Amino acid sequence: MTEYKLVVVGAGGVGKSALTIQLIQNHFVDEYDPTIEDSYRKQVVIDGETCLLDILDTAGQEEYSAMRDQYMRTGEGFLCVFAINNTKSFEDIHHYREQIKRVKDSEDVPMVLVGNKSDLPSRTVDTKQAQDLARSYGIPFIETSAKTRQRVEDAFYTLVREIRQYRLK
Numbered sequence: 001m002t003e004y005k006l007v008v009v010g011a012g013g014v015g016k017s018a019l020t021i022q023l024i025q026n027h028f029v030d031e032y033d034p035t036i037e038d039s040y041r042k043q044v045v046i047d048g049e050t051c052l053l054d055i056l057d058t059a060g061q062e063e064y065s066a067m068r069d070q071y072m073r074t075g076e077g078f079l080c081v082f083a084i085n086n087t088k089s090f091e092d093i094h095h096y097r098e099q100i101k102r103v104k105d106s107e108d109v110p111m112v113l114v115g116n117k118s119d120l121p122s123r124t125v126d127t128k129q130a131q132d133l134a135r136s137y138g139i140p141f142i143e144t145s146a147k148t149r150q151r152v153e154d155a156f157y158t159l160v161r162e163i164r165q166y167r168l169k
């Protein structure tokens with residue numbers, strides 16, 4: 001058993017809850033109250049390791065929050081989610097990365113950039129712009145659909161793999 005403390009952040013409505021609940025409970029939620037902040041624990045096997053994932057699905061995204069500072073201190077990896085049909089949510093990404101780096105007082109922050117809602121046809125964020133942003137940060141970029149489950153496990157398992165790479169640096 002190895003524990004991994006993951007935190008899902010991103011603007012309201014991008015699919016943080018839907019992604020987390022798809023991973024843990026294998027169903028898509030259409031109407032999950034946006035103010036619910038809670039953790040979900042589950043054992044999974046990734047690269048031959050039995051992993052305990054302890055995932056915090058965050059609700060409020062306010063800068064000034066003692067509890068956000070605390071979960072940024074405690075969290076080991078961060079899933080930074082935007083929606084591919086919401087340019088503003090893509091612009092919010094750099095603020096989250098900045099907040100997390102400040103709390104960690106480190107450049108070494110395990111992070112995965114997730115462009116969710118890949119099933120929606122009216123894209124506003126070009127995949128290649130998101131790939132450029134991820135490259136600039138030195139982090140993986142994955143597009144997911146919580147609705148169809150596309151790359152949901154990939155997003156969270158990639159974040160686990162990032163935490164291991166960092167545990168050796």
Ligand SMILES: O=C1c2cc(ccc2O)S(=O)(=O)/N=C2\Sc3c(Cl)ccc(O)c3N2CCCCCN1C1CCNCC1
Nearest residue numbers: 005006007037038039054055056067070071072074075076
């Ligand atoms: O009271 C909380 C709660 C607790 C905390 C932060 C935010 C938050 O909404 S905490 O920092 O004191 N606990 C953490 S941080 C954390 C991380 Cl970074 C990953 C996985 C975690 O499980 C985790 N936790 C504990 C889980 C907090 C759940 C959210 N929560 C209440 C707890 C009582 N039941 C309703 C949700």
Ligand SMILES: Nc1nc2c(ncn2[C@@H]2O[C@H](COP(=O)(O)OP(=O)(O)O)[C@@H](O)[C@H]2O)c(=O)[nH]1
Nearest residue numbers: 012013014015016017018029030117145146147
């Ligand atoms: N089409 C589509 N809708 C999604 C997807 N993920 C979430 N949603 C919807 O977007 C809305 C917000 O999702 P939610 O998970 O509550 O967002 P959160 O505020 O980031 O937790 C809900 O109506 C979801 O059903 C997705 O991958 N595709």
Ligand SMILES: [Mg+2]
Nearest residue numbers: 016017033034
């Ligand atoms: Mg939510």
